[PDB]
Amino acid sequence: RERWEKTSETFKNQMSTIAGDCLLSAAFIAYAGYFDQQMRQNLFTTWSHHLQQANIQFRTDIARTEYLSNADERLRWQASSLPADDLCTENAIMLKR
Amino acid sequence: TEALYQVGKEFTSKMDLEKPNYIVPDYMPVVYDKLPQPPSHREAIVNSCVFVHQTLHQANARLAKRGGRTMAITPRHYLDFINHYANLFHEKRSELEEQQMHLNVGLRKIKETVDQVEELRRDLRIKSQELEVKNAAANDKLKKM
Amino acid sequence: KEWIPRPPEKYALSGHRSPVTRVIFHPVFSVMVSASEDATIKVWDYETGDFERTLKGHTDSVQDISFDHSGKLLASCSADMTIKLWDFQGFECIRTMHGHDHNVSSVAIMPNGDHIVSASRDKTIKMWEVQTGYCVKTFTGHREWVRMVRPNQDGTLIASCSNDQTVRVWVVATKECKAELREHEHVVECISWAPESSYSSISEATGSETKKSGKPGPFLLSGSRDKTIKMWDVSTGMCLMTLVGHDNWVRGVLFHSGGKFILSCADDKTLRVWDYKNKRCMKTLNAHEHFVTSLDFHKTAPYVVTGSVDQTVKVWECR
């Protein structure tokens, strides 16, 4: 009941950052596929700064891989000999969405 | 840039993208030159979407200057970006409502549980009070002997 | 027209997992919409009684829903402290509207088709913009939970009922309680106004005298938990007749499309059709095995829809 109450009170805050979080996630899936990890971060960083300068709320604490997939999918992917790498995790996400 | 903005406005009209308490920054990173001077939250979102598309063009030019292999950036990429934006927004919002619905019901069951627990306290004392008078009357009558 | 529900039913739709809170008729399409307490809005085809789709965007129990004049937009209010606007073409939530603290009770769209009103436990009524979503003005003066709120037929006059035993009529331009009515024995729950088809029928049914303009004045009706239905004059503020005979609390009241009879629902597990003209028709119809929550009357079709606590929505023929 303590955990549920804590998540319930923060529900309003979570709904506020959906537009910002989805915009970053959508761009990563559509655009950052071809580039390496060095510039996938650079493209993400530039987009994040623009959102900050535009006063658009977005969650800077959660990872994109965590946001776009659940643990069950990640566990199932690891069962399919997917390397346990962030870039490999991102690639699997783009192969699904 | 105008073509990208109009595509963003038309495709994202279905999504909410409305913040009544939106605060306009003093230095708005204006990408679309015809954006209204006091832009709304929806207009700001589309402006960011256009900026994202133009970011890739700068990124690809950086590789070409460095001599790396580049891939063409086409409007189909922009269409994929807005398609993903529409799908992700609906998915993330829908899950949040379903999750909060289940949590709201769960807390409601808990607060009804504690209420019935308090009801058992009143039931217990009534049972205890009835027991005390029952044995006291039983002892008194059994002693009329 | 002498449309009257009959004891035989046509369809008993039961798809909700939680008690149904309100039922409405689509203005143009053959669509019947029901709102329940499971945060889901279900859409039915009353002609054939087939479940069509559900709108599960809400978080907590949905309280009241309303359409517009064109039947294009659906406004919803729930206990999640928000007002949701639905686009009926594609059936998606297009604008979520916040504020108006605590459980929101009722919501309605004025025939202007541009502004929305709402009522909640916070003892106030808020007026919104459908286009933008910003509450320009707020109505204050109710000292308790405002239950049910309806506008007029031209978006100028608004009546609100509350637990404070007062039914206050508000004005769009002046934002003042033109008429305050504090005379009900117990809590007022449901209110509805009078269409133009019934203004003439009131004059000789009550003996009311026409004013200098000759127009009988706006009319009000309020249903309360005191098992009494009382119809009121907005222009003056005095009673004309009190309808008594409900066994339990009344929950929904509205006028017949022909403006001749009275149809109402109450917690007496039965629907009562009453005549105010001569007190001749006192038809009592058993509707549900449990408490009956709300009802509606189709503008032209001879159909009536009732919602109840038993997770079942029923449609009756009119004859």
Curated annotation (Swiss-Prot), chain A:
Family: Belongs to the dynein heavy chain family.
Full protein name: Cytoplasmic dynein 1 heavy chain 1
Residues of the full protein shown: 3486 to 3582 of 4646
Disease annotated for this entry: Charcot-Marie-Tooth disease, axonal, type 2O: An axonal form of Charcot-Marie-Tooth disease, a disorder of the peripheral nervous system, characterized by progressive weakness and atrophy, initially of the peroneal muscles and later of the distal muscles of the arms. Charcot-Marie-Tooth disease is classified in two main groups on the basis of electrophysiologic properties and histopathology: primary peripheral demyelinating neuropathies (designated CMT1 when they are dominantly inherited) and primary peripheral axonal neuropathies (CMT2).
Localization annotation: Cytoplasm, Cytoskeleton
SUBUNIT field: Homodimer. The cytoplasmic dynein 1 complex consists of two catalytic heavy chains (HCs) and a number of non-catalytic subunits presented by intermediate chains (ICs), light intermediate chains (LICs) and light chains (LCs); the composition seems to vary in respect to the IC, LIC and LC composition. The heavy chain homodimer serves as a scaffold for the probable homodimeric assembly of the respective non-catalytic subunits. The ICs and LICs bind directly to the HC dimer and dynein LCs assemble on the IC dimer. Interacts with DYNC1LI1; DYNC1LI1 and DYNC1LI2 bind mutually exclusive to DYNC1H1.
Gene name tied to this protein: DYNC1H1
Signal peptide bounds: none
Cysteine pairs bridged by disulfides in the record: none
Function text: Cytoplasmic dynein 1 acts as a motor for the intracellular retrograde motility of vesicles and organelles along microtubules. Dynein has ATPase activity; the force-producing power stroke is thought to occur on release of ADP. Plays a role in mitotic spindle assembly and metaphase plate congression.
Swiss-Prot record, chain B:
Location(s), subcellular: Cytoplasm, Cytoskeleton
Coiled-coil region: 91-145
Function: Cytoplasmic dynein 1 acts as a motor for the intracellular retrograde motility of vesicles and organelles along microtubules. Dynein has ATPase activity; the force-producing power stroke is thought to occur on release of ADP. Plays a role in mitotic spindle assembly and metaphase plate congression.
Description of its domains: Dynein heavy chains probably consist of an N-terminal stem (which binds cargo and interacts with other dynein components), and the head or motor domain. The motor contains six tandemly-linked AAA domains in the head, which form a ring. A stalk-like structure (formed by two of the coiled coil domains) protrudes between AAA 4 and AAA 5 and terminates in a microtubule-binding site. A seventh domain may also contribute to this ring; it is not clear whether the N-terminus or the C-terminus forms this extra domain.
Family statement: Belongs to the dynein heavy chain family.
Subunit structure: Homodimer. The cytoplasmic dynein 1 complex consists of two catalytic heavy chains (HCs) and a number of non-catalytic subunits presented by intermediate chains (ICs), light intermediate chains (LICs) and light chains (LCs); the composition seems to vary in respect to the IC, LIC and LC composition. The heavy chain homodimer serves as a scaffold for the probable homodimeric assembly of the respective non-catalytic subunits. The ICs and LICs bind directly to the HC dimer and dynein LCs assemble on the IC dimer. Interacts with DYNC1LI1; DYNC1LI1 and DYNC1LI2 bind mutually exclusive to DYNC1H1.
Protein name: Cytoplasmic dynein 1 heavy chain 1
Originating species: Homo sapiens
UniProt gene name: DYNC1H1
Residues of the full protein shown: 3099 to 3243 of 4646
Curated annotation (Swiss-Prot), chain C:
Designated name of the protein: Platelet-activating factor acetylhydrolase IB subunit beta
Alphabetic keyword roster: Acetylation, Cell cycle, Cell division, Coiled coil, Cytoplasm, Cytoskeleton, Developmental protein, Differentiation, Disease variant, Lipid degradation, Lipid metabolism, Lissencephaly, Membrane, Microtubule, Mitosis, Neurogenesis, Nucleus, Phosphoprotein, Repeat, Transport, WD repeat
Segments for region (Interaction with DCX): 276-318
Range within the parent protein: 92 to 410 of 410
Provenance organism: Homo sapiens (Human)
Gene Ontology terms: biological process: acrosome assembly; actin cytoskeleton organization; adult locomotory behavior; ameboidal-type cell migration; auditory receptor cell development; brain morphogenesis; cerebral cortex development; cerebral cortex neuron differentiation
Region Interaction with dynein and dynactin: start-end pairs: 1-319
Misc: Originally the subunits of the type I platelet-activating factor (PAF) acetylhydrolase was named alpha (PAFAH1B1), beta (PAFAH1B2) and gamma (PAFAH1B3). Now these subunits have been renamed beta (PAFAH1B1), alpha2 (PAFAH1B2) and alpha1 (PAFAH1B3) respectively.
Cellular location(s): Cytoplasm, Cytoskeleton; Cytoplasm, Cytoskeleton, Microtubule organizing center, Centrosome; Cytoplasm, Cytoskeleton, Spindle; Nucleus membrane
